[PDB]
């Protein structure tokens, strides 16, 4: 079960495979983009326009495509923005290469050209960069928001998405420190409840997890009581109560004395264990198993809410901000072995009776977990993806104040620059540098084709104004506004992101054009 094909004709097989990958992802590019139906292994129906999930759930058997996907993962992991453009641009770069192959251009002569042409394009893009953070700090916050809405207004939340941008820009403002000059995106957890509306999503200044207090007589809010070590959370596997197995018992009872004798044992272990909560230093107790009712009533006098059947990772997320520990026994617990917060309160959301638990530090917290609602279970999944992506939108805008005015205008601006350097080639490479422009044009072309605009005249419309007039942003009208000028529409992409799109795509040309054999061995 191996392949046999000799000559450059094998590269025609390889490129024709890439055209299949593109025919999938192509139609997903743009805010007017078309969705894909994803058949889950279990039959679950997922509908998304996100090329990261489209490529992740895309299953193809040609190993050339498996390379294209594995390499595109680096766009999602390092940057997290335009994985879609990596595949779309690469396909066009390979499509123009197919023409170069037939013209007799040696495979390496092709690769050397795309490398030097990228050195021209990225440089000419830098000549047009702009500083989104210029002037005042309040202007930074303003423009930071104006762009964040461009990523959120493209999803189902677009009706009132400004509210998801409210939590996003304010979150990264809380999570970003200009002295640190970096944003640890793991400091933000994405979590919501199934059902609700856009206005039911909240900006939460602290940790919220899918839990509620296990006993209604315990206080829904615990405070340090003016000066204590905040609110400590007990993270244990066993409850504070007389020991009772959760599998089998097998306690032989020989007489009535022995029968009720366990209740005597329970009374001392009831008060001992609930005193061991207070002595151990827990203000609330969360254990993998629940707590005895009589212990629960003895906990009441000390205001010791508790929660049952909770996994370690969920309490870990709290323990990250509170510096808690999973101590094997309650006897070695301390004010520090049990992590500390300032306030734990249980919040009800209108008709939502879930009443989730929120852990705050009564100050600027080291972590936030924002609250997401949406009218359909699957809307919530994508809505949190919008917060994930818009979190990376502002994360890159913090990383690099340099931005480009996008919408295909930067690609056409770079395309025109490549055509300017075409006349300066006057050599064999002139064949290849020109094709780089023909490939750069496929991004604004794809943007127009997914929008319902003229696939050819749109290219001449953008090139006309970006050539005869000025480098002023002349974008694609996919948003349905009046005309071009994304500076007026405040549609902006990160500079470092577009640089990575061009450079990573060039790497894909180095990877695909330099594979001459596909040897697929069997398995024993």
């Amino acid at each position: 079960n191996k392949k046999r094909q000799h000559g450059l004709e094998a590269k025609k097989s390889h490129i024709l495979a890439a055209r299949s990958v593109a025919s999938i992802i192509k139609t997903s590019l743009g805010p007017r983009g078309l969705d894909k139906i994803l058949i889950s292994p279990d039959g679950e129906i997922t509908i998304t326009n996100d090329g990261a999930t489209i490529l992740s759930q895309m299953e193809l058997d040609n190993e050339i495509a498996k390379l294209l996907v594995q390499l595109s993962k680096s766009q999602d992991d390092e940057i997290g923005d335009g994985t879609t453009g990596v595949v779309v641009l690469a396909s066009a770069l390979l499509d123009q290469a197919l023409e170069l192959i037939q013209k007799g251009i040696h495979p390496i002569k092709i690769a050397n050209g795309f490398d030097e042409a990228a050195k021209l394009a990225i440089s000419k893009l830098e000549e047009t960069c702009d500083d989104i953070s210029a002037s005042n700090d309040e202007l930074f916050r303003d423009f930071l928001l104006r762009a964040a809405k461009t990523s959120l207004g493209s999803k189902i939340v677009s009706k009132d998405h400004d509210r998801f941008a409210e939590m996003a820009v304010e979150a990264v403002i809380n999570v970003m420190d200009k002295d640190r000059k970096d944003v640890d995106f793991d400091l933000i957890k994405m979590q919501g409840r199934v059902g609700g509306s856009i206005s039911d999503s909240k900006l939460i200044n602290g940790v919220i997890l899918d839990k509620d207090f296990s006993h209604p007589q315990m206080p829904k809010c615990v405070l340090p009581k003016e000066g204590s070590d905040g609110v400590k959370l007990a993270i244990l596997t066993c409850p504070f109560e007389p020991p009772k197995p959760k599998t089998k018992h097998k306690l032989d009872i020989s007489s009535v004395e022995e029968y009720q004798k366990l209740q005597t044992y329970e009374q001392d272990k009831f008060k001992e264990m609930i005193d061991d909560v207070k002595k151990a230093g827990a203000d609330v107790v969360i254990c993998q198993w629940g707590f005895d009712d009589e212990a629960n009533h003895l906990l009441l006098q000390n205001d010791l809410p508790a929660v049952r059947w909770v996994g370690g990772q969920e309490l870990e997320h709290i323990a990250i901000s509170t510096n808690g520990r999973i101590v094997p026994r309650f006897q070695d617990l301390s004010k520090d072995k049990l992590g500390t917060c300032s306030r734990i309160y249980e919040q009800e959301f209108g008709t939502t009776k879930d009443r989730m638990l929120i852990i705050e530090q009564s100050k600027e917290t080291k972590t936030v977990t924002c609250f997401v609602r949406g009218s359909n279970k699957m809307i919530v999944d994508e809505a949190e993806r919008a917060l994930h992506d818009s979190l990376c939108v502002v994360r890159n805008l913090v990383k690099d104040s340099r931005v480009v005015y996008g919408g295909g205008a930067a690609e056409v601006t770079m395309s025109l620059a490549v055509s300017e350097e075409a006349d300066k080639q006057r050599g064999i490479d002139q064949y290849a540098f020109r094709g780089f422009a023909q490939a750069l044009d496929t991004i604004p072309m794809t943007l127009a084709e997914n929008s319902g605009l003229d696939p050819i005249g749109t290219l001449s419309t953008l090139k006309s104004k970006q050539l005869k007039e000025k480098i002023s942003n002349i974008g694609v009208d996919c948003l349905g506004y009046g005309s071009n000028d994304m500076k007026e529409l405040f549609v902006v992409d990160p500079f470092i992101g577009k640089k990575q799109q061009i450079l990573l795509a060039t790497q894909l040309c180095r990877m695909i054009l330099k594979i001459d054999n596909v040897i697929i061995s069997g398995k024993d």
Binding site: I24, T27, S28, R32, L34, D35, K36, I37, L38, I39, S40, P41, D42, I45, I47, N49, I54, Q57, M58, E59, Q217, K244, H249, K250, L251, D252, I253, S254, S255, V256, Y259, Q260, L262, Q263, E266, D292, D293, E294, H297, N376, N450, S451, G452, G480
Partner: protein, 503 residues
Amino acid sequence: ARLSAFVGAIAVGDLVKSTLGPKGMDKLLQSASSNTCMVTNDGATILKSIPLDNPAAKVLVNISKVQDDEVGDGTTSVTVLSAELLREAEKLIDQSKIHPQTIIEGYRLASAAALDALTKAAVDNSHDKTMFREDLIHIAKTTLSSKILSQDKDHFAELATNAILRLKGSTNLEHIQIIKILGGKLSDSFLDEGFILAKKFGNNQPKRIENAKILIANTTLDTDKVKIFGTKFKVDSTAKLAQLEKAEREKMKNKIAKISKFGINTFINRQLIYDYPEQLFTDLGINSIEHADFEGVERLALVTGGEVVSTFDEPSKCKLGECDVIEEIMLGEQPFLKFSGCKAGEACTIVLRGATDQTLDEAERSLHDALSVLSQTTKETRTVLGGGCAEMVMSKAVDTEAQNIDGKKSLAVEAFARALRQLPTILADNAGFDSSELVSKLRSSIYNGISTSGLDLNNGTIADMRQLGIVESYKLKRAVVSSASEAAEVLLRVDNIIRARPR
């Protein structure tokens, strides 16, 4: 691509097309089990029962499943309108070469047009409270249709009308209880505030308890251990085991001491009670009820107004229930217990008097959903003209907005109206009246004034719907447009079907 993608929706429409209307046709269900012979015009049963292969058709199912829980009615009209919107689009795609997004954008503009028309036709009676009551009869007159109850609808109209008039305030739907009683034609049904339970109270307690104090226990009182549950009877002599149970009887009485600590006249338990702690309830003069299920516990919490009372440590610091009359009666050929005048209870129970099980099964769904529709008419007092009028009213406004709109989008808005004109067409065909004559004569009526006409499918003509009393909900018809608007947006955006590694 789209030849394979959108076609999945066409099948969904044909599965439900014949089920819409007062005279609808039935579908037969049968599985490989061979014993699942079901005949129903119910869209919820049909939609949930039919397995579908095309995942795009599975999308329409999930869309309508939301309609079922969100509103409880109109699930047929969502599948019909949403399918006809996609069928008109399939014709636009091939014949005119229309971009998929162009069709999506047109239905968005048309959604605003339809919402304007339904708003213009809103007729409300917050004045003339008597007419609001009559409108509730007329809304039920239309909502109670499509069922095997159609022969007895007039009786069910007054039953549901008083039920919604009984709430006379908050729209709490769980206040409504439905009892399935065998025996008699459906006209024998009656509405009673008694909140009927099928169990009695006490061992020997007086059957009429007035000014009762009801205490609910939610746990197991069969050999009720005072939190020493988990011990074993492990003795070398049988006599010792019986003594161990007497130790439980000491513990049961301590639990009964805490339960009776409240000073109660009546007591209700989720689970069964052992003769001894039950005899203690009997000896203490407490009206004791056992073996209450989820609804027994949940409804009593909403009826009697108390707690599950996990803590019996004090007569206060918790809600204790009350009932004006606890009436034990032999009614419906089954011993019934009736709680009348529960803690500030403004509710009632609807008792269905049917012939057999399958008939009561359908009336359960009919009345369950019927009051669900009426529950929205208290908050939304604006009503809509039925009989297909509103569908034709929308078709006129959509054609009106098509007068002023650009080209690529005008082809979709006009098609949107053609889809709206399929709604009254399916209704007329399922009633067996000339599907072309009736729909066209509707058009001449609505185009040349007369914004009150609709289909008289009982007599086979076109009549003033305000005279015939065919009334719809503003929210119901708005949700038909709204749910269909979102439904089309989802399916029109499908460009391919991608399969991950199947299991």
